Amino acid sequence: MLQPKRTKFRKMHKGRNRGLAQGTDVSFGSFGLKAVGRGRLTARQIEAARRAMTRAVKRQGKIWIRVFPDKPITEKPLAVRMGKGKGNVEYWVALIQPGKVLYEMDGVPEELAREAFKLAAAKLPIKTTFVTKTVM
Amino acid sequence: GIREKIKLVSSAGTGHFYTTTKNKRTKPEKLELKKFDPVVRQHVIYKEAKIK
Amino acid sequence: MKKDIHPKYEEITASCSCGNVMKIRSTVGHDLNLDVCSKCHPFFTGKQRDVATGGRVDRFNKRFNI
Amino acid sequence: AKLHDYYKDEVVKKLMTEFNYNSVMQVPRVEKITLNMGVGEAIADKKLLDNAAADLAAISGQKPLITKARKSVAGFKIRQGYPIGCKVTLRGERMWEFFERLITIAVPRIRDFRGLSAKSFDGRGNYSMGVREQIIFPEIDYDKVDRVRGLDITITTTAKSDEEGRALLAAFDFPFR
Amino acid sequence: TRNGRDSEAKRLGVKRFGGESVLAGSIIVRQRGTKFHAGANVGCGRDHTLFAKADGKVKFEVKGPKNRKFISIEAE
Amino acid sequence: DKKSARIRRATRARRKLQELGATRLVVHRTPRHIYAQVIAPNGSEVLVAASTVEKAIAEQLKYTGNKDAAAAVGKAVAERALEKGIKDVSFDRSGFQYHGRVQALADAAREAGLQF
RNA sequence: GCGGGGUUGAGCAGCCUGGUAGCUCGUCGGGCUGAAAACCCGAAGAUCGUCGGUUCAAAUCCGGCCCCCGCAACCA
RNA sequence: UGCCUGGCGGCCGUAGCGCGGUGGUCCCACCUGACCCCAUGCCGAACUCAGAAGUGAAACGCCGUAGCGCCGAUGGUAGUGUGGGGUCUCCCCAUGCGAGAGUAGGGAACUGCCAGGCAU
RNA sequence: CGUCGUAGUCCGGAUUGGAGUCUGCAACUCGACUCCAUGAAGUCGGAAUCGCUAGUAAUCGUGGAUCAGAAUGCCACGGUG
RNA sequence: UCCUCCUAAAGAGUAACGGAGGAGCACGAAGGUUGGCUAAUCCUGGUCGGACAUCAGGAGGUUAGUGCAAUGGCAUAAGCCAGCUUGACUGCGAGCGUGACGGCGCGAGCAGGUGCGAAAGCAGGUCAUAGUGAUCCGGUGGUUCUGAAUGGAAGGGCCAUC
RNA sequence: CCGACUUACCAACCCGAUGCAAACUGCGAAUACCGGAGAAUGUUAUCACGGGAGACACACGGCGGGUGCUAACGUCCGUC
Ligand SMILES: [Zn+2]
């Protein structure tokens, strides 16, 4: 489960998730899984998807992960009132905007990549699509 | 706040005095400066004395 | 240089063991007698044979013969 | 003065012909000789730092500069501003006199001396060599010294490359190997 | 928690903007460092405050090799 | 490097003179020659300029790079300024120490009539 | 949720204004006894609970964490 | 009025580095010497004085060069003031403003006053 | 008789390098001795403990058995005491 | 109670038991002026010397430093070194900033006298922002200002201060 | 003492490519705010002084957010 080794500050504001994404194109591999929706991917979701797609491709080829969960999400303990300061960090997320390529993969066939990305996408909250590397 | 305050009495014989602070543990020697004395309108030597 | 902060420094005469006399300026004040100079030290003739590598077979042959 | 004029005629001719220099000023020359004496033990005792200053003044006829720690370091338990060394800078006439005195008296008296090292030229023609005992300088009195110290000589020259500085030092019959 | 403290606002910022006619001695900007540097007819106070020394209109300009912002008082 | 250090030394007093809007007398000192000029408060145009490379001032001197030469050029620049009505200026040492040749030029200009 | 604590194998001092680690029992090697205790002599030992941070330097100072001991968890 | 050099600016990288070449009649720099003026927490290195035997080697100036730094459109994108709408965590429509990054490209500065040297 | 003058020393000889002698078919593991160079620890010894009542203790050499060579051990012998 | 950043929506201001840290001091030089200087870190060479002491050269260009937290500054250095000194003066202040107010803050310049510098000039504390307590009552020094018939005095006022 | 090679191991600095930041900025709007000039419109709508107040529990909706579960007809600000 990916999480930052160190951080400048422990807690971070809730924020907003407006705008479009930056990593629109497949940069390293030959196939990518692009998000068409909007939301936040937790570390557990990223780990589960990575395990699913690695097992699916039987540890062949190479796999990149273009996202990293760096936003700390807090929540208050069970049965406490609304004040008394901010809650304790429980998990980490990565804000996702539409068009963001989450994972990349090469070294395996096309249809095998299709099946691996489908199995991976089946464990994610946001809606995804399959994209291939394009010249220029 | 180990730095305690003192007064600099004029040497001109007038009762005029300035006031400041000093660290009596590391500077035991008395303070002497030339300051303006507005009664005689001249810069005279002021000597450190007990604040009382 | 400053006037008085420095040590006394003037001309002397140094005479080597090999008779090579040199006139130089130093702080000794009195004259000086050298036991080895640069022109007499064995770094041209003595320091060649100093390796003392040694031979085992020539030495063996020297001790006895057949 | 002897090595100075010796340089001004013989060394300049030798370098001009063996390096094919176009200008006389391109020929390397020695600018300064620094004499450092790192006294780490001075933190424990001040009575042995003025002694080191005295014998350095005896060796080269200048009152040395009592250097101080640039930055605090715990590994040697010193704080910034502590005096831990003494140095001397030699330029011009005094530099030439000390150079001739060293090359003709000091180095032949080094115990088990078998030649210096030609691999101490710092890659930019500035040679630096260290002596193990200060008794090689006849200015000091052997019986009246209290502890055997040591120093390090640094010969700073204007030579850009490494072979130019080596050739310049060799032209004065330096005892390399 | 241990995060309840804060300090009172210092009311900094530019008090007279460019092309404004001001009287001598009036504060132009209250700053912390020397974000704006004093030009002609503008002095720098104890806390780096730039103040007009003569009546006129405020002039902002970028000058120097370091691209520093200077404030001067144009003649009027 | 030395020239850069000298410019760095002078560039504080030059800004102060400009801020005070004073017409300044700049002196430039080289080993063989010495130069002097009085520059207007805007700093972009000079008013009078005297220097030892000028033949008219050079031919009366044994060597152009000594104290007497400095005194001569200082007196010359002072006379030219007074002739043109400029009499109240500020002296700009231009990074050199106010001693020797620069001090010689300054007191010569002072006794010659200039005010600084 | 709040105060105190974590130190040679065990029980414990001192962490003092951050440069410096001490006691008893225990342990090791000789001595006494025929032998084992008791006794005598000489030795040794610690990364001061974990991890970040400010210093030239943290067992000491700061913040988070784990364990142990008390205190409180009431009006309905 | 043409070239070169020095001083003070305007402007603050299209003006700055790097590579190669080039400059000494004058100027500038390194250079020679240090009782004196003055100076080194030691040192004529710096600072200072008295000078011209040598060299443009270093530095500095000039010229050439796109390996960088730097500037940079047009068009598109993001954001947004006003009014309206939706599937309302976020978007879309009418209208006005319109980036940043990147692309083609530009680019080895330009200019004012004074003085000196060489030619007209 | 001379020298050393309270020192790690002209005390002490360990350790190590080079060159040898003798015995024995054969001195590497693993003999004794010699020459040159080297000169550790040691400055009278904690708790404790041993021998000795007269030619004894202490101290200084000499011989023998074993044995081709190989004792600071053992068994004897005398000198001072 | 006070200071620094964010929350704070590109002038100012702006709340929560919101997110993070500090202050209740220090300095007779660590202040003023004149003159001078440039770090951090790394590479190479060098006696003890070691990853790290001091020396020489190079790369680098402020990633360093500021008496202390953070932010904004700083090469003309506000950072570092040396000489001389008390402007850490007295009475004032055109004109502004920020406050409901009490108040707090910036300020050229005038008069007297002073320090540094040859001089133009700079200096009314410290690179700036925390380092703090209104009033009453009482203490000390100065000043005929006042002084209950008059002359004093006590007490009170004013100035400096606890 | 020097060292000897290679080992499905980790990895500083630098170079190329790709993201993230409220407490990061070599860039950077729309708005908003201050000032100057002009015309039209508005029952001076603006400011100063004096007499009298009330109010200092706010609510929801849009936009920008903190906190909460990007929960609440939740809570706290800015603006309409
Ligand atoms: Zn000789």
Side-chain angles (χ1 to χ4, degrees):
Chain A
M1 264 165 41
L2 301 180
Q3 164 187 1
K5 297 177 177 63
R6 302 176 40 256
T7 61
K8 209 186 316 167
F9 304 99
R10 282 194 320 171
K11 316 186 187 187
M12 179 164 300
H13 280 345
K14 186 193 318 301
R16 290 305 189 266
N17 194 24
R18 321 183 37 202
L20 290 165
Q22 275 310 311
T24 314
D25 302 297
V26 178
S27 298
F28 308 119
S30 311
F31 318 107
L33 183 68
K34 168 182 295 198
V36 286
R38 168 186 312 270
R40 39 175 71 163
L41 290 194
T42 77
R44 291 181 180 280
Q45 296 167 356
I46 295 159
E47 186 45 52
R50 186 202 58 78
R51 283 177 193 163
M53 84 165 57
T54 311
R55 194 181 309 117
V57 301
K58 292 183 180 180
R59 313 183 316 101
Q60 295 326 105
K62 197 155 173 47
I63 280 177
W64 289 262
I65 303 182
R66 305 273 303 281
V67 301
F68 183 86
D70 60 320
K71 170 154 198 159
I73 300 294
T74 62
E75 69 189 7
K76 289 202 90 54
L78 198 47
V80 292
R81 288 175 177 174
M82 276 298 111
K84 276 76 191 176
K86 202 175 168 68
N88 293 318
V89 180
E90 289 290 337
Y91 55 98
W92 299 74
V93 305
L95 298 172
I96 306 300
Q97 297 89 354
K100 164 77 70 175
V101 162
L102 312 176
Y103 297 89
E104 294 202 8
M105 161 194 304
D106 75 333
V108 295
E110 201 259 330
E111 62 282 353
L112 176 63
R114 291 301 184 112
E115 282 331 296
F117 279 162
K118 181 180 191 171
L119 292 185
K123 308 254 187 309
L124 294 173
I126 301 168
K127 193 182 303 283
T128 77
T129 177
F130 180 93
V131 288
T132 60
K133 179 188 39 198
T134 80
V135 64
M136 183 169 309
Chain B
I2 202 183
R3 202 169 171 84
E4 68 171 50
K5 52 178 102 173
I6 57 180
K7 63 199 299 178
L8 294 171
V9 188
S10 158
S11 47
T14 75
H16 188 268
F17 65 94
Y18 283 77
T19 184
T20 184
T21 48
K22 90 174 306 193
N23 185 1
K24 291 190 169 178
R25 305 318 302 275
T26 76
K27 300 275 167 166
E29 74 272 31
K30 296 307 181 171
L31 190 54
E32 275 194 17
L33 287 161
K34 284 182 69 69
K35 313 282 280 299
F36 184 65
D37 186 314
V39 177
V40 302
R41 304 180 47 191
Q42 287 295 337
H43 287 85
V44 299
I45 293 187
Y46 278 74
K47 295 181 174 188
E48 158 188 349
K50 209 59 67 194
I51 190 81
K52 196 170 313 312
Chain C
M1 288 167 37
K2 300 199 188 176
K3 281 314 165 182
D4 64 279
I5 77 176
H6 297 296
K8 196 168 309 314
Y9 181 84
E10 68 269 356
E11 188 88 35
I12 63 159
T13 305
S15 67
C16 178
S17 167
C18 74
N20 164 34
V21 68
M22 297 164 305
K23 223 174 196 297
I24 59 172
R25 295 170 57 204
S26 172
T27 81
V28 287
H30 62 70
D31 290 330
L32 193 77
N33 210 294
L34 271 290
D35 64 275
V36 63
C37 76
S38 81
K39 289 180 181 179
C40 77
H41 177 281
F43 197 51
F44 62 97
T45 195
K47 284 307 185 174
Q48 282 71 2
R49 190 70 268 163
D50 60 342
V51 307
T53 187
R56 197 68 195 175
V57 193
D58 50 358
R59 160 187 174 273
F60 180 88
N61 287 322
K62 288 145 29 188
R63 301 162 74 88
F64 63 92
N65 308 269
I66 321 172
Chain D
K2 172 180 184 177
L3 291 181
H4 186 26
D5 70 20
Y6 172 79
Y7 166 80
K8 290 163 60 178
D9 43 34
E10 301 194 27
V11 186
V12 308
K13 290 210 318 303
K14 190 182 204 167
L15 296 195
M16 281 286 294
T17 181
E18 83 181 1
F19 278 108
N20 205 35
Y21 286 139
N22 58 80
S23 169
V24 194
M25 302 295 293
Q26 212 175 348
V27 160
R29 71 189 67 92
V30 58
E31 187 175 1
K32 65 175 160 178
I33 291 185
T34 314
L35 264 56
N36 169 37
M37 286 198 56
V39 177
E41 56 274 1
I43 50 182
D45 179 22
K46 271 74 70 175
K47 296 304 311 302
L48 56 76
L49 177 56
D50 46 347
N51 301 142
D55 76 11
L56 198 47
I59 287 183
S60 67
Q62 293 187 5
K63 181 178 107 54
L65 168 80
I66 299 195
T67 78
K68 299 185 173 59
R70 162 170 70 87
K71 69 175 179 188
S72 193
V73 64
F76 312 126
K77 58 202 55 195
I78 72 183
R79 203 175 261 146
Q80 157 178 343
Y82 291 168
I84 59 173
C86 64
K87 82 187 273 192
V88 163
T89 308
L90 301 163
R91 277 189 184 99
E93 206 83 350
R94 301 289 181 111
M95 178 193 72
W96 283 120
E97 297 178 30
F98 171 83
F99 188 41
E100 61 171 357
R101 168 154 27 103
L102 182 73
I103 199 171
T104 58
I105 296 182
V107 64
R109 290 161 50 103
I110 290 178
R111 59 174 67 259
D112 191 18
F113 164 67
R114 215 172 65 259
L116 281 298
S117 164
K119 305 283 291 299
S120 314
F121 281 92
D122 65 2
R124 310 208 78 97
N126 297 260
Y127 185 73
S128 160
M129 50 151 301
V131 299
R132 318 194 196 164
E133 49 181 10
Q134 79 282 8
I135 71 165
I136 80 178
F137 290 94
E139 274 101 329
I140 69 158
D141 207 13
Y142 158 84
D143 43 350
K144 278 212 311 188
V145 66
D146 49 310
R147 307 182 66 263
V148 182
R149 285 86 157 84
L151 72 163
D152 60 357
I153 303 299
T154 299
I155 307 159
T156 299
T157 79
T158 69
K160 309 173 229 162
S161 76
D162 203 86
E163 57 184 359
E164 288 174 11
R166 182 183 297 107
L168 159 70
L169 294 174
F172 290 92
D173 294 347
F174 203 68
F176 277 131
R177 208 173 181 89
Chain E
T1 193
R2 320 149 51 226
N3 299 335
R5 285 88 60 204
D6 202 352
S7 55
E8 310 265 32
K10 288 315 167 192
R11 278 88 168 171
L12 308 184
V14 186
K15 305 301 188 191
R16 296 296 158 90
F17 289 89
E20 201 150 328
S21 65
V22 302
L23 295 172
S26 67
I27 291 188
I28 294 186
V29 57
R30 285 181 67 233
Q31 57 175 350
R32 289 304 84 168
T34 53
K35 179 169 310 182
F36 305 90
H37 285 272
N41 283 317
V42 166
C44 201
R46 190 185 88 77
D47 60 348
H48 313 277
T49 304
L50 299 196
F51 61 104
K53 277 180 165 189
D55 314 326
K57 299 197 178 185
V58 184
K59 175 71 166 80
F60 285 85
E61 60 193 346
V62 193
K63 295 209 154 175
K66 307 199 181 192
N67 309 334
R68 299 197 153 157
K69 320 155 182 58
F70 281 91
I71 304 175
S72 54
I73 291 283
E74 277 188 359
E76 185 259 330
Chain F
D1 174 43
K2 174 182 309 174
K3 169 171 182 178
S4 62
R6 188 180 62 75
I7 289 293
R8 187 215 69 233
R9 280 173 289 173
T11 187
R12 182 157 220 271
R14 294 179 155 171
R15 305 306 294 183
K16 197 55 151 72
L17 287 191
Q18 154 180 353
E19 172 180 345
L20 295 166
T23 184
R24 45 162 183 154
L25 166 57
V26 191
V27 55
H28 177 65
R29 200 268 313 278
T30 55
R32 191 183 301 276
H33 287 290
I34 181 161
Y35 310 80
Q37 65 183 173
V38 184
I39 307 182
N42 54 47
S44 44
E45 61 169 21
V46 310
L47 309 182
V48 304
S51 76
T52 64
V53 299
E54 296 196 5
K55 196 197 305 294
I57 319 170
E59 63 201 0
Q60 312 291 339
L61 280 162
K62 155 205 193 299
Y63 189 64
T64 52
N66 56 6
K67 288 190 208 195
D68 295 316
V73 56
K75 177 176 188 200
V77 67
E79 293 165 349
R80 293 183 190 184
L82 288 163
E83 179 184 16
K84 278 157 189 323
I86 304 312
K87 79 191 282 308
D88 185 74
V89 300
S90 283
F91 188 70
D92 164 38
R93 54 193 195 81
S94 66
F96 303 100
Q97 303 287 102
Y98 180 80
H99 159 280
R101 288 214 268 160
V102 184
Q103 184 179 3
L105 187 140
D107 52 37
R110 270 168 203 260
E111 69 83 20
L114 267 192
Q115 288 184 356
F116 47 82

